Nucleic acid binder design. Structure first.
Lengths: 282, 165, 115, 60
RNA sequence: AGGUAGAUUACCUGACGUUCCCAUCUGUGUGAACAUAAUGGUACUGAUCAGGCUCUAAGCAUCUUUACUUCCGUGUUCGGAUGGGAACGGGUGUAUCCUACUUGAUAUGAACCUACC
RNA sequence: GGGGUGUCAGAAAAGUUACCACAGGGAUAACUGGCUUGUGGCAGCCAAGCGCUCAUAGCGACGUUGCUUUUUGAUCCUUCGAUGUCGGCUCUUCCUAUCCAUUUCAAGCAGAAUUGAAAAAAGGUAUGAUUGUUCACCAUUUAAUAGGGAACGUGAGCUGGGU
RNA sequence: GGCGGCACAUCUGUUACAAGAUAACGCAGGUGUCCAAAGAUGAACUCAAUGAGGACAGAAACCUCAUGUAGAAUAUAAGGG
RNA sequence: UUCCACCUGAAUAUUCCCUUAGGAAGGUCAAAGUAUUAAUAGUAUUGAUUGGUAAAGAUAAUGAUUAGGUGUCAACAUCUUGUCAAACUAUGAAUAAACAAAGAAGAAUUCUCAGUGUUAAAUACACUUCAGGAAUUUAAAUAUAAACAUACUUUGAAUCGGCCAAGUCUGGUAAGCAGGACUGGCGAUGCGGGAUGAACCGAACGUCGAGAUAAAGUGCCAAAAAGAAACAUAACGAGUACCACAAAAGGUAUUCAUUCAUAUUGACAAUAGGCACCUAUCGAAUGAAUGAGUCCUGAAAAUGGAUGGCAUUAUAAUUUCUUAACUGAUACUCGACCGUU
């Protein structure tokens, strides 16, 4: 029939596949080479990026500098280790992102041994206002670069909560304070969201309207016993308990075979069985 | 009769390699060039800004200066009856690490390895090893014996002409 | 091979090498093409190359010794006589019956009529 | 009265009579238009070594 | 085993089906606020009720494609050189260099840093 | 920086001389000669057919191979301190791709008249009206009134009709 | 020579001979402009076409899904991207 | 456009001009004057590259084009088939182009080490005579050639009308036509040979003596050959390349080879008997096709004439050979003399 399929062997001879990671939809190579390109007259001096990736459950933050062999990670700070600092639930908020961002800033400075001269801000009253690290004595702050990946940068995007935590942690990340949870309203709007204000106000609103709706949205919050009013102070201790111990943490891994390949002996034998039966049916 | 345009006669010279369009490698911008290295000028038509002249395509040059975004390249140009020095500033997207001294560089390593042993043998008293032999063209082959136990004979004669139709 | 139409060459015998040097040999001394007349003239030219006699000059050339290049460069190119170059003419290869090309061991016959 | 327009005949023979004049070694060692910071580093050190050397000559 | 970042950029692609999820990833629920548009479909944010259904990843097939290997074939063509042959046209011999298409066999990825099982 | 030279490294510029003048040129045209032969002329090979039957007595389409320099082209090699530039008259000689006479063969050759072809260039091949004409077209006569070359034969041989 | 044309300043492909240079009154074409956006940057989207569907609606109107290596578009001539 | 000898010895590219019969910058060239000299290569090899020509491809991308199947007249799909591209291309040579094969002065190692700057800070890194300094070892790292080598500096002459050949190309029917890429020549060049010839072949030149040679020749002009085998030659046939001419086609003319059939007691032609057929004699080759050489026709122009001429004809022509045969240039070897370095 009238098909005219454009998939013939003549189509694939001229076909040119894209880059592998771009083919996967994970890497934007047009903006990557802008964040990789160190000045040529800086011979092999590392250029540092903050790889911020937010999954459905976990906020991943890494410090990576590019090399020809691959990308090397200087330090990583996940959000699933927040239960070690008192935050049991809500690992993907504007609040947990701030703690995940702050944890990496303190963890890296401790590893480099420069955490005594660079301390940032700590009090909760100054959580809402902008702060950029400055020169201490004559030593410049550690400088990084934000890598948001394939994430749209809105006016309240969580990827700027990770950035805000790092700056308050003592790490210099160049930025402008027009995309945090503020950029409108005032500092307290940003500061409250850093303390889970939007989550706390949700339950006290959802409970006011309905009960099954409140149970469906916050099922594990109710079971764990987390009151809506305790969110603000449960993150202050998380910020406190992070600054005094960000130094990471320490069996046999369990493997599961998946399919395994087929050798040429089995590959050739199967065709022979198929060929032999073809005459038996014929 | 041609025109005197800057990029004349580049229908095939400036065409991208087959199935080699789109973005270039990442190691192109990550390679670290240093003064004194050998490079090859390869005009990448995909980047129209700072594209070097078509006469320097394929020319091998020496890096003489490193700038924040461009790499200085110094090649030789041929003029009426003399040769002049051409100094260029080329972004890494158009140059390539030359491999002209690949054979030479490994010979230096072979000699430096032997010399390092000769300082481990003379003081300890052992006889010192000699340097590797120099390169020579293919010399005449020497005489040798061919065994008659694993040999076989095939006769060679002109072939009777057979038609292909 | 590139200069084949203008040269004929082959592999010489020891007798051919001896007669070429003894009868037509010469050396470059002080920029002068002086013929071989003494072993002192050979010792002076090639003293540092461990060649003092004409038979040492012959032996180095024939066996292609370690100091062949220095010894061979000293000898001036022999000026030979005229002889019947070919059967047909010198416009074809020796394989076709011509004059130029690789004569292998047959260059000695041509050299005999030319020395 | 038409003429012949152009010919390259006997032009390579003319060019190889007094052959291709190679540039001297001084042509490859020029440093005009180099990196500004690299030039500043070299000038700063050359002034430091020169002053020290001239001071010792002055003392004696 | 899985996830993040990659470098090589089809041995990595495309089509027909198949295998697990124990962690992770994903899909999945919701729309009050940051923020989003004609549409909570996208993007944004809040969450964990269920699911391996698609993804993703691992494998199958006389699978197109792709990458190596022999063969094609010393065949086409080519540098040097006749007072060589032919009325032309074109085509030897000599000393040399030697592709391509095609077909057949093999493979269907290798490899780097960080965390967790 | 702008105002422009488009002949675009950038003068401020209409014709005609047949009444013409000078320095020069075969660096360059008009005539012969020379290479070429598209064009012109002539000749072959094949056989679809015509020829009442019958491709080849006589023709031979569609294709295709050559010869000639008697047309016109193409070029610019010789001649620019000059090779007298059309035709006609007079005269000699040469070519055959023969018009007649001579000797032959073939026919769709009964005779007569013819047509195709071979030997053969020793002999002959005209008179006038119109036109400067070469050419042409007419009226005759003749065995026939063939085609061409010789610096497009021939101006210290003529004529000066043309240019 | 004149008449015609510009091979007179100039760009693209080819002649052109796999470095560079490069002929003809060689071939097919092009320039004396156009743009406050058609400059710069950031974000989002993916084009031409084909298949299957939806009132008028049909070969061409608009909407949806699938395939879709650019077969579209990019001021202009051609070639590159 | 006015005397002699000796030495060196060119040009027809590129840029600009009211430029095209001419000028200036520049190239080739000459003469003077230098430097111990990171300052040799029209070459080959090994190593890593660049290219897109010759070639090749033709439902591999863009176009061109001959048909045959299968699936739902045509059409559209899909599988094959024949032929193509200077302004098409996946692939892609040979020849080429530009590097490296050890010059801050011929390597390497160890110790020590400073100023700026990069940097989060650096003991990393970058440049600084491989900053600098001192010890130890050391002349090694493809081939070939090169000290009247190499690198030049200054001043300046002439010249930019070119022409020819081709195992090359474009326009043209073609041209001893017009214009180009690479090289070699004539111009500027004589000598030996092609009879005669600017370019072809050998080979380039101070004055000579002797010898082997080159291209090419050895019946006479004309120095120098004898032998062997064949297809030629009953004809102005053949006879020294460039070169001075010949085609398509036809022949029961001739030589060799291949394939096929009949050749025996009997194949063909002939004779006799009942044009085909069968009988007897006749007794050895016969018939058919094709290919490769030579020959004949095809083959007609003007002064009388040109293998150079005379002449040859199992050559004194042609094709190939054999013989430690020969002849011959101003080129090669040896010797003598003149001049330059």
């Amino acid at each position: 029939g009238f098909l005219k399929v454009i998939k013939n062997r003549a189509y694939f001879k001229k076909y040119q596949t894209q880059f592998r990671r771009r083919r996967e939809g994970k890497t934007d190579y047009y903006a990557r080479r802008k964040m990789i390109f160190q000045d040529k007259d800086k011979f092999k001096t590392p250029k540092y990026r903050v790889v911020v990736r937010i999954t459905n459950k976990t906020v991943i933050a890494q410090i990576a500098y590019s090399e020809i062999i691959g990308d090397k990670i200087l330090c990583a700070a996940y959000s699933h280790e927040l239960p070690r600092y008192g935050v049991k639930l809500g690992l993907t908020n504007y609040a947990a992102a701030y703690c995940t961002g702050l944890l990496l800033a303190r963890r890296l400075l401790q590893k480099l041994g420069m955490d005594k001269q660079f301390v940032g801000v700590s009090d909760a009253a100054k959580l809402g206002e902008d702060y950029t690290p400055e020169e201490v004595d004559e030593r410049r702050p550690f400088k990084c670069i934000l890598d948001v990946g394939l994430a749209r940068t809105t006016t309240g995007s969580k990827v700027f909560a990770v950035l805000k935590g790092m700056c308050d942690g003592g790490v210099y990340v160049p930025h402008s304070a027009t995309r945090f949870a503020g950029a409108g309203e005032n500092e307290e709007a940003l500061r409250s969201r850093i303390l889970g204000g939007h989550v706390a106000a949700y339950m006290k609103y959802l409970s006011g309207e309905d009960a099954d709706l409140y149970k469906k949205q916050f099922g594990r919050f109710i079971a764990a016993g987390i009151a809506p009013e305790a969110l603000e102070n449960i993150y202050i201790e998380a910020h406190k308990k992070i600054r005094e111990n960000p130094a990471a943490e320490k069996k046999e891994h369990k493997k599961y075979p998946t399919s395994k390949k087929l050798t040429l002996e089995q590959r050739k034998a199967a065709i022979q069985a198929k060929l032999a039966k073809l005459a038996q049916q014929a | 009769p041609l025109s005197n345009g800057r990029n004349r006669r580049t229908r095939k010279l400036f065409k991208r390699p087959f199935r080699g369009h789109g973005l270039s490698n990442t190691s192109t911008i990550l390679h670290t060039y240093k003064v004194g290295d050998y490079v090859t000028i390869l005009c990448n038509s995909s980047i129209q800004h700072g594209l070097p002249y078509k006469a320097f395509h394929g020319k091998t040059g020496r890096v003489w200066n490193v700038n924040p975004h461009a790499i200085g390249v110094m090649v030789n140009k041929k003029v009426n009856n003399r040769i002049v020095v051409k100094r260029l500033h080329i972004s890494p997207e158009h140059i390539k690490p030359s491999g002209c001294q690949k054979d030479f560089l490994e010979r230096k390593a072979a000699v430096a390895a032997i010399r390092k042993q000769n300082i481990q043998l003379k003081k300890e008293g052992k006889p010192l090893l000699p340097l590797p032999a120099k390169r020579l063209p293919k010399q005449p082959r020497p005489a040798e014996l061919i065994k008659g136990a694993d040999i076989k004979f095939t006769t060679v004669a002109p072939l009777k002409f057979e038609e292909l139709y | 091979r590139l200069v084949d139409p203008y040269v004929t060459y082959g592999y010489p015998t020891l007798e051919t090498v001896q007669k070429l040097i003894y009868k037509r040999g010469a050396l470059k001394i002080n920029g002068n093409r002086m013929p071989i007349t003494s072993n002192c003239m050979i010792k002076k030219a090639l003293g540092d190359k461990d060649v003092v006699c004409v038979d040492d000059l012959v032996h180095e050339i024939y066996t292609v010794g370690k100091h062949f290049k220095e010894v061979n460069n000293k000898l001036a190119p022999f000026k030979l006589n005229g002889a019947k170059i070919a059967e047909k003419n010198k416009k074809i290869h020796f394989i076709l019956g011509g004059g130029f090309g690789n004569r292998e061991l047959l260059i000695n016959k041509l050299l005999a009529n030319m020395i | 009265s038409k003429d012949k327009n152009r010919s390259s005949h006997n032009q390579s023979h003319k060019a190889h009579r007094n052959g291709f004049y190679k540039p001297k070694k001084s042509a490859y060692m020029s440093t005009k238009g180099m990196n500004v910071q690299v030039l500043k580093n070299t000038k700063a050190q050359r002034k430091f070594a020169l002053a020290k050397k001239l001071e010792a000559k002055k003392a004696a």
